[PDB]
Amino acid sequence: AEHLMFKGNLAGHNGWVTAIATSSENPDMILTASRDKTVIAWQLTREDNLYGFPKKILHGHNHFVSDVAISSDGQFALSSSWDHTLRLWDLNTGLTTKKFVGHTGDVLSVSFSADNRQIVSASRDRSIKLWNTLGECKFDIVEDGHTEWVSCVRFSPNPALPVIISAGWDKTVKVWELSNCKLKTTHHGHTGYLNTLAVSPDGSLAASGGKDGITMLWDLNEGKHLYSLDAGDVINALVFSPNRYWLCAATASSIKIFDLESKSLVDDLQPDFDGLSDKARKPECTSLAWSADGQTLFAGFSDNLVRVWAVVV
């Protein structure tokens, strides 16, 4: 029987866990970003009492950390912050090697290209910027750009159509051709602002989500909308499983796991909140990541914890 099985918590942050990153290079490590202004590198022990412990606490941002990524070689962390900057960290030394300065508003998203030669980020300043790995901004994508905050930006891993995808508070999803940085497609359809966006491991699908409870799937090869899945509530985070045809949506109320083959619901994760139900709103899941091999789901929450589920059968 295959299904997510609660395995434990990672405790250590002192603010909402806002992003989680994972890599094949070290499967025993997790990176988490937080409103406590730190990134933590966790060592996973997978023991029953502690699933893991914080191994390194990366200090330096002056405001909420909003997103984090790991280099393909697993040795560098890349994070964005409401303090207007990105930072590249050496995970061996735990120090920042490069600061990316240039945005003029809160940075809400950051990501590595497949080959790690390019870095892309999105900000409240309504721009998308491309950097190199030395911290130099190489292009400012504004033309025909979003007219509100840009909340999430990602690369397509499809070698044939090199694009970046962005979602914004203008309720649209935009596809940009990477070669010249010109707008390729604007997708309309969402009725509310968007928090998040994820791309298929084969780069055929993009999923977008936000204030309307609806996650919409867009065909990156062809023109347009494919279908929509109704999550129950405001969508905080979206991620595709790397090794199953599944799409997970973290909402205010729950974590829904959608089977894409059937459009059916695989699971609805609602953790037992170790506290109470007295004049208190159940903590929201604010971030999601799969392990590289797709056997472990990590979920960050507004009660400062990471919660871990292990695919069982």
Author numbering: 2 to 314
Show sentences the authors wrote.
We determined the crystal structure of Gib2 at 2.2-Å resolution by molecular replacement using Asc1 (PDB ID: 3FRX29) as a search model. The asymmetric unit contained one copy of Gib2. The model includes all of the C. neoformans Gib2 residues (314 in total), except for Met1. The electron-density map is well defined apart from the first and last residue, as well as a short stretch of side chains between residues Gly276 and Arg282 in the extended loop linking blades six and seven. the structure features the predicted seven β-propeller fold, with an overall shape that resembles a donut of approximate dimensions 45 Å and 10 Å of the outer and inner circle, respectively, and 30 Å in width. Moreover, all of the seven β-propeller blades are arranged radially around the central axis and comprise four twisted antiparallel β-sheets labelled A, B, C, and D, starting from the inside. The interactions stabilising the β-propeller fold are conserved in blades one to five. The network of inter-blade hydrogen bonds between conserved residues observed in blades one to five is absent in blades six and seven. Deviation from the conserved structural motif in blades six and seven might be necessary to accommodate the extended loop located between these two blades or possibly provide a more dynamic binding site for protein partners. Although the middle portion of the loop seems to have a different conformation in Gib2 and Asc1, the knob-like structure in Asc1 consisting of stacked Pro276, Phe278, and Pro28729 is also observed in the Gib2 structure (consisting of Pro272, Phe274, and Pro284, respectively). Although Arg57, Lys62, Lys87, and Arg102 (Asc1 numbering) are not fully conserved, they are mostly replaced by other positively charged residues in RACK1 orthologues. Based on sequence and structural similarity to mammalian RACK1 and yeast Asc1 discussed above, we propose that Gib2’s positively charged and surface accessible residues Arg36, Lys38, Lys57, His60, His85, Arg88, and Arg100 contribute to the interactions with rRNA.
Although a classical G protein β subunit was not found for Gpa1 in C. neoformans, Palmer and co-workers reported that a Gpa1-interacting protein, Gib2, could function as an atypical G protein β subunit13. However, based on the amino acid sequence analysis, Gib2 is more closely related to RACK1 (receptor for activated kinase C) protein orthologues than to G protein β subunits. Hence, Gib2, a scaffold protein interconnecting various cellular processes through binding a myriad of proteins, could also bind with the ribosome and function in ribosomal biogenesis and protein translation. Apparently, although not essential, Gib2 is important for growth at the mammalian body temperature and is required for full virulence.
